């Protein structure tokens, strides 16, 4: 209703289109009283299509696949911030 992003089950997902590392992404979400999405919360829902390849609260990008020759700790990715709504 007044969620500028994805609304799902009393939660509002605001997309940050600015590419950031996990540590910085986690910070920007906290600085706005929110957190990064939870993998179990989004996998097997319609949000997966929007949030795949974005940061999950654990520090891994959310993926349908559970793979890897990449050091995620050194990468940048987009992110959603989750504030609980209603």
């Amino acid at each position: 209703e007044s969620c500028n992003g994805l609304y799902y089950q009393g939660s509002c997902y605001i997309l940050h289109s600015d590419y950031q590392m996990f540590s910085d992404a986690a910070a920007n979400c906290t600085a706005e009283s929110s957190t990064l999405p939870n993998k179990s919360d989004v996998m097997i829902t319609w949000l997966i299509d929007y949030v795949e390849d974005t940061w999950g609260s654990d520090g891994n990008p959310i993926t349908k696949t559970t793979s890897q020759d990449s050091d995620v700790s050194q990468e940048v990715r987009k992110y959603f911030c989750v504030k609980t709504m209603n």
Partner: antibody, heavy 113, light 113 residues
Framework: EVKLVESGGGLVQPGGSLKLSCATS????????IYWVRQTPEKRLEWVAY????????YYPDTVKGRFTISRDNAKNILYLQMSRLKSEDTGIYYC??????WGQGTSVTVSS | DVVMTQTPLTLSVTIGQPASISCKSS???????????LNWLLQRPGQSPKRLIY???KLDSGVPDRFTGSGSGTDFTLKISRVEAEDLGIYYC?????????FGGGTKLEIKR
């Protein structure tokens, strides 16, 4: 087979500029973040320039900020390190590394009058 | 940056003997995803660095079973159970958990014969 090849590197006078090249093949250039790491004569290893996956972000250490700039060429798949205001402590073998997994052969850069 | 201290600086070991190097970070290297990103690189002289061990204990392909990585938070250990002629060079620990990559001082393996 992932392949990285450093280029440029001559002798530079304390103040001059030099532009290095890291030629890549065997992997999708944009999919990977790449570091520029140098080896001093004392043989310690130091990062001097990071460029993110998809090129979105670039980062430098304080010793090198405001004088080192990292460039890129998506057509040719080449990575550039433009350096200037060269100090004598910038001397060493410069590597580009696609993670700690893959290092090029390296290129020699000496700073002396 | 995250400070990495290796000990000792030089290691002088007879062929066929056990050897070990320690590595200490100023900060936990435990990433938020449960994994700890500590790597052990080995650099021969005249060559670019090569990775032997990643994620504390996992060995790269080819690497003999003699090399064994250990540790959890800020305290890490590389063990060579039986030193062989080809193990010579400078061993580095390098941390991947916190940006940027930072290296230890290096530990030169001088073979005794």
């Amino acid at each position: 087979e992932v392949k990285l090849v450093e280029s440029g590197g001559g002798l530079v006078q304390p103040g001059g500029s030099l532009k290095l090249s890291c030629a890549t093949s065997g992997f999708t250039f944009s999919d990977y973040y790449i570091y520029w790491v140098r080896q001093t004569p004392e043989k310690r290893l130091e990062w001097v320039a990071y460029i993110s996956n998809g090129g979105y972000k670039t980062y430098y250490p304080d010793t090198v900020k405001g004088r080192f700039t990292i460039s890129r060429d998506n057509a040719k798949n080449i990575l550039y390190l433009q350096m200037s205001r060269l100090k004598s402590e910038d001397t060493g073998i410069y590597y580009c590394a696609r993670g700690m997994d893959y290092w090029g052969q390296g290129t020699s850069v000496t700073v002396s009058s | 940056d995250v400070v990495m201290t290796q000990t000792p600086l030089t290691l002088s070991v007879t062929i066929g003997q056990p050897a070990s190097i320690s590595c200490k970070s100023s900060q936990s290297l435990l990433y938020s995803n449960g994994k700890t990103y500590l790597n052990w690189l080995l650099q021969r002289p005249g060559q670019s660095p090569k990775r032997l061990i990643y994620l504390v204990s996992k060995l790269d392909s080819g690497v003999p079973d003699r090399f064994t990585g250990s540790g959890s938070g800020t305290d890490f250990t590389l063990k060579i159970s039986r030193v062989e002629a080809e193990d010579l060079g400078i061993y580095y620990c390098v941390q991947g958990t916190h940006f940027p990559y930072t290296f230890g001082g290096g530990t030169k393996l001088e073979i005794k014969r």
